[PDB]
Design a protein around this ligand. Sequence first.
Ligand SMILES: [Zn+2]
Ligand SMILES: [Zn+2]
Ligand SMILES: [Zn+2]
Ligand SMILES: [Zn+2]
Lengths: 83, 171, 47, 158, 138, 26, 157, 157, 42
Amino acid sequence: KAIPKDQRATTPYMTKYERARILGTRALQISMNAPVFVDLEGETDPLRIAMKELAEKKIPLVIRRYLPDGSFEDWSVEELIVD
Amino acid sequence: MFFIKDLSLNITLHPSFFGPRMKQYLKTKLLEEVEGSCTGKFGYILCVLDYDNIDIQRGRILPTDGSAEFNVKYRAVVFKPFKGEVVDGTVVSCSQHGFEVQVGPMKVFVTKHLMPQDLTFNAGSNPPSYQSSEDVITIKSRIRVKIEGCISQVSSIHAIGSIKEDYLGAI
Amino acid sequence: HNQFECKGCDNKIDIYQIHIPYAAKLLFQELMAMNITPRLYTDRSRD
Amino acid sequence: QALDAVRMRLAQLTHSLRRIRDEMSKAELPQWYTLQSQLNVTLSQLVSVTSTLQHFQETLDSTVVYPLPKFPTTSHESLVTTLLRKKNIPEVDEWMKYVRETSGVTTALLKDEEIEKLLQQDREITNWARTTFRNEYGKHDFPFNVDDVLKFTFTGEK
Amino acid sequence: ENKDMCPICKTDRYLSPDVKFLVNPECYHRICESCVDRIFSLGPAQCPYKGCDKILRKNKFKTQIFDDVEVEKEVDIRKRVFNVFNKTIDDFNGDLVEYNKYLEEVEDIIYKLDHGIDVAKTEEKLRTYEELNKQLIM
Amino acid sequence: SYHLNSTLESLYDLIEFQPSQGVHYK
Amino acid sequence: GQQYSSAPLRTVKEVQFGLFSPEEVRAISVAKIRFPETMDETQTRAKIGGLNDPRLGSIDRNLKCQTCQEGMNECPGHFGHIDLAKPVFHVGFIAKIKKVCECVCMHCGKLLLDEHNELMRQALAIKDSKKRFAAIWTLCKTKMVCETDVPSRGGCG
Amino acid sequence: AATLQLGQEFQLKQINHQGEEEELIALNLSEARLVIKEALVERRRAFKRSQKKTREKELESIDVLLEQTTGGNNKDLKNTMQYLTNFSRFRDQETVGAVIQLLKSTGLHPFEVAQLGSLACDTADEAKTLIPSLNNKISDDELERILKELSNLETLY
Amino acid sequence: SNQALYEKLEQTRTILSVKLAELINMTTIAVATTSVMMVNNQ
Ligand SMILES: [Zn+2]
Ligand SMILES: [Zn+2]
Ligand SMILES: [Zn+2]
Ligand SMILES: [Zn+2]
């Protein structure tokens, strides 16, 4: 039932699955004409643009980590420490 | 009847509408789909009250296609017919089975068998009118119809009325 | 004409749409032919 | 029964006059449509009250109204006199007597006994005037097909 | 009677008589529930009670403990005319002669109504009812 | 009534009649 | 590639498994199927009221399946029924029914033993249904006489 | 039917979007017009706010000025405004407050008082015949009195 | 746009003339003060 921010006791590191689905969904949105928040260096492939947004944490998403008891947490990808 | 009820609708948005102003778009869609349309559960939706304090809740992303889904709770003025309900209306189209009364956004039909015996159909007039022993039912004439039954199909509602009983007929 | 029914339970409003493989539909129809009810619910009643 | 509507029409009178007060309380006068509309509402309330008042003039004169022992009169006395003051404002009675002096018939003609004949002449001139209005209102009354041409320019068929 | 209470449902004693038998004041005829409900439900028409032609209207029914149609009509008309006349020329001062004479006139009117005479005096009694109602309105 | 008459005159003293601009208030 | 539908799209969550009641079978079915023949007498179309009539589903693409309309690539199918004049048993339940016949009286239709027996009191406390039916079956399969009076109860005997 | 037993969403017990309990809101064809015509005004103010950065002619003209506000997909609401206005005899929300004061003084159901205020009747038998729910729930003389005060509240506009 | 001038102008003429006749028929017949202000408003 939405655990508050002071009680979030999950791993602050972004896993490979979270990075994978964030890059996949973000790249899918970029392929569907989504507003890009980072200036492009001449890229054409959507996955490279998604990784470019992840490298600067400009992806506007938040992860709803489901807990085994039915609860969940909201860890934004901007505050998640990548790698 | 003209009632007011709090309705909830799930709005789908394309990933191209994720600008900071997207909330406005929501309301825009929330109007374009809700006002004027009809539902088989709440009747003909007329207006939507409270446009400033519209709750947005939280948008969720469904798997494929990447479109956004929203659950909106608002207050709206709707119109729902009921069985055995005395209403008033004006005729639009005329038929040998009966004249089609227009009550608000609903086009009720009155069967010829559900009419008194003195009320007869007249096709020789232009437009064809129902002439009785005292009243003449024409298009622009106002008739008080007692609705006997209503049908609540999805996005389509039709009702059946009658004027055989007392205190009914032309106004 | 956008019309739906379910025979035997008096419903013409609440109808859900689901995407299942054709083999699963063959399984459900064979279970119905075998006097077994594979009732599907989109909501969690047990909670 | 009638005063149940008199209090409502006088309430709308107070609300309308208060709205005119708010419109006139500004430095520059706003639009004239709202002013004339509120004035028409005021006149409608005044006429609406005077109509029912003149309709029930024999019933109100057949009863007396004065407070019951259930009344805090031992503390306030002049207020109770103000609530049942038949005496008009000195301006309406004063200018009323002045207009009575500037009406073309005084009490000196009451001594001469001669008013019903003048009233008869008046009503007669009403008849003449209405007939003249009857007459004066009776005097007036109140190429080709673009797809076929282009089909010719592209295929040449007529 | 136990043999006549509806021309279609005249013997429902062995069918568990759970339905009532309404009587319209403009017919004085017994009709069971499932029949009369369809009668005024399909339209104000006459009941086929032994070839009855008087129209049966919607609603406006009554429960009957059975005191014969004569006495029931005499007490319905008796109460109605008693309400039309109200307390006119009755308990106004305490007189006994004129009061009993007026009561004699009223009971003679009810007698002429329950007998009908020749459908001529009863109409004058109806005009008397309209006059008394006009006096009660004023 | 009389008071209302007073207002009704006062406003009519501030009317500017123009066929293209309508009624103005000076 | 199928046709669009206005019904709300949701996922499939809870799945309940149960037996088909005959009344529900008659409420789901649309045809009675009385003729054992396959196609019509004219060797074409369908028998109309038989083993494969247009009241059910259809193939061959060209046919429309009367009661869904649409096509075969869209038709889920439709159900018929068969109203028997003599009740029959189901194979996968022949044992279970038999166990029921060993758990209940064959006249008054009441459970053997009673709640006054201590072993039954201990067996009823189990939360698992299969173990309850198992142990209760082990108790009721031995006692071969219903009883009217049991000291600290239904009749029969 | 018309026996004080509506549908599920039209029951006497309603629930708002906050989670509190609220009675069913039933409106007659008097204030129902002033509420639509009312909210359309603030809707016009909302449309002209973001833009920065005799009785029939005014009705249709205002319905056009409000039709320019909407996207031309809800003209049945304007035709409904012509229906109500052509069948409305009330005006001003103050008098409507008086009407609610006269309807709530008897202690009836909101749907019943809605059918009372929405219908033009002269006698009590008319109100008892047009409204099958009201036949013995309230006295006839009181209904005739309500129709008298209402008859004094109606004015040709 | 000329039909609006037909209906509008003709309506102003009918209100002017008919309201003038109503005026003269009300000048010739607190009722007196209400006649004063009704005539003045006409
Ligand atoms: Zn019968
Ligand atoms: Zn009869
Ligand atoms: Zn099919
Ligand atoms: Zn036994």
